[PDB]
């Protein structure tokens, strides 16, 4: 029941500053070691820095130590990130991580992980989707099965999540990587396999969120006879 | 600082079947004075954190089943899973918390060995709310098929499509191990409506000749 629950998506522009924090719950906050880690798309993890957040001493990474600053909150058991000046090597996913503070020793695995806070470091503006049907052709209803989905467009930055039914439907459902179109806008799409008769009958919702516009739509994907 | 050093960087195992994992460091991670190795593993799944796997070297993680076994002393380490299950696949990176600044591997990407599945291949044509905006997205699915490997190729009343048209391929599922694939192809409003023909062309291993899904614009 220890979590670590990290703070949402971050846009900002080159040059400026960012702060992703680190709420603690189901422990004693000032008992164990907050660590930070920097994971880049697909690539290794790298170390930032420790705090301990009962006498608020940070140690860095020799590699990090003029881009970060930690900081923790015992009142609101949080632990901060700040991170500065930034550039494009500095988008990438930002990791708070639990480690043992036993036997006098920093010297510890890490054993609980929050989820991760994901900056990207840009010029361009948010810009929250556009929700398209996806209504398969007719040979693609053939043989009893279907697919259908739903088109989330032009938008900035990075991430959207997509649900079907409001959490309901989850078996069958792919929902892809974006990917970077031409405009610089991010285009996704999510799709469900289902019975070819259900078409007429069950109602199908694509569920999309995009936090960073404040964006939620819900859209009926109903078949198109065309 | 200490280097960590991971290999395979990849490998693909069927289920069943036993694989194991070399971490090296560039330095003991041996403490004299205790005689343990300052040695962890975790596992990261797709779309998830590392989660802690072995730590000093050999010990398991609390809820973390038998079949995961770490070994090795000093510099030389190794993860074994004795029989891997299809919800293994992940990456598993090794740490070093011996000396600061801690420092990791780069990671061994465990990928699932399964039989040759042939894509079940969908094509969406634009709605009609996408063509009040000026712009037409065409969409091709390629679902559960393995390997990874696929060719699409977008044609236009038979016209080979370059340059306007994009695609993404999911993570390997974690039940039975196969991979999809969307691919878009984007179009004006203005020279959607001057063709007739939608075509996706799909190769495959599992299938014997490429396939083709197409519907012609207002018959879909
Ligand atoms: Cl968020
Ligand atoms: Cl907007
Ligand atoms: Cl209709
Ligand atoms: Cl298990």
């Known amino acids: 029941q220890v979590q670590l629950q990290q703070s949402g998506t971050d846009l900002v522009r080159p040059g400026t500053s960012v702060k992703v924090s680190c709420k603690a719950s189901?422990?004693?906050?000032?008992?164990?070691?907050i660590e930070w880690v920097k994971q880049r798309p697909g690539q290794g993890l790298e170390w930032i820095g420790v705090?301990?957040?009962?006498?608020?001493?940070?140690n860095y990474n020799e590699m990090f130590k003029g881009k970060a600053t930690l900081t923790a909150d015992k009142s609101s058991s949080t632990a901060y990130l700040h991170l500065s000046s930034l550039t494009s090597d500095d988008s990438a996913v930002y990791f708070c991580?639990?480690?043992?503070?036993?036997?006098?020793?920093?010297?510890?695995?890490?054993?609980?992980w929050g989820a991760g806070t994901t900056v990207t470091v840009s010029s361009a503006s948010t810009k929250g989707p556009s929700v398209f049907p996806l209504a398969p052709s007719s040979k693609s209803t053939s043989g009893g099965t279907a697919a259908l989905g739903c088109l989330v467009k032009d938008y900035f930055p990075e991430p959207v999540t997509v649900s079907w039914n409001s959490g309901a439907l989850t078996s069958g459902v792919h929902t892809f990587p974006a990917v970077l179109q031409s405009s610089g806008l991010y285009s996704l799409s999510s799709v469900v396999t289902v019975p070819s008769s259900s078409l007429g009958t069950q109602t199908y919702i694509c569920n999309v969120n995009h936090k960073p516009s404040n964006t939620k739509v819900d859209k009926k994907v109903e078949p198109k006879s065309c | 600082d200490i280097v960590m050093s991971q290999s395979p960087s990849s490998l693909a195992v069927s289920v069943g079947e036993k694989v194991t994992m070399s971490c090296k460091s560039s330095?003991?991670?041996?403490?004299?004075?205790?005689?343990?190795?300052?040695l962890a593993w975790y596992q990261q799944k797709p779309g998830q954190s590392p989660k802690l796997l072995i730590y000093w070297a050999s010990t398991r993680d609390s809820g973390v089943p038998d079949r995961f076994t770490g070994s090795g002393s000093g510099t030389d380490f190794t993860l074994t899973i004795s029989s891997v299950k299809a919800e293994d696949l992940a990456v598993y990176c090794c740490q070093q918390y011996y000396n600061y600044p801690f420092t990791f591997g780069a990671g061994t990407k465990l990928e699932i060995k399964r039989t040759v599945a042939a894509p079940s291949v969908f094509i969406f044509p634009p709605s009609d709310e996408q063509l009040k905006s000026g712009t037409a997205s065409v969409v091709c699915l390629l679902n559960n098929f393995y390997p990874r490997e696929a060719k699409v190729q977008w044609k236009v009343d038979n016209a080979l499509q370059s340059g306007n048209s994009q695609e993404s391929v999911t993570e390997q599922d974690s039940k039975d191990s196969t991979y999809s694939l969307s691919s878009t192809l984007t179009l004006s409003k203005a020279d959607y409506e001057k063709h007739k023909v939608y075509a996706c062309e799909v190769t495959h291993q599992g299938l014997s000749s490429p396939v083709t899904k197409s519907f012609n614009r207002g018959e879909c």
């Open positions: 991580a639990r480690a043992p503070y036993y036997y006098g020793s920093s010297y510890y695995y890490f054993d609980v």
């Open positions: 330095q003991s991670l041996l403490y004299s004075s205790n005689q343990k190795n300052y």
């Open positions: 705090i301990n957040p009962g006498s608020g001493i940070p």
């Open positions: 189901g422990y004693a906050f000032t008992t164990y070691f």
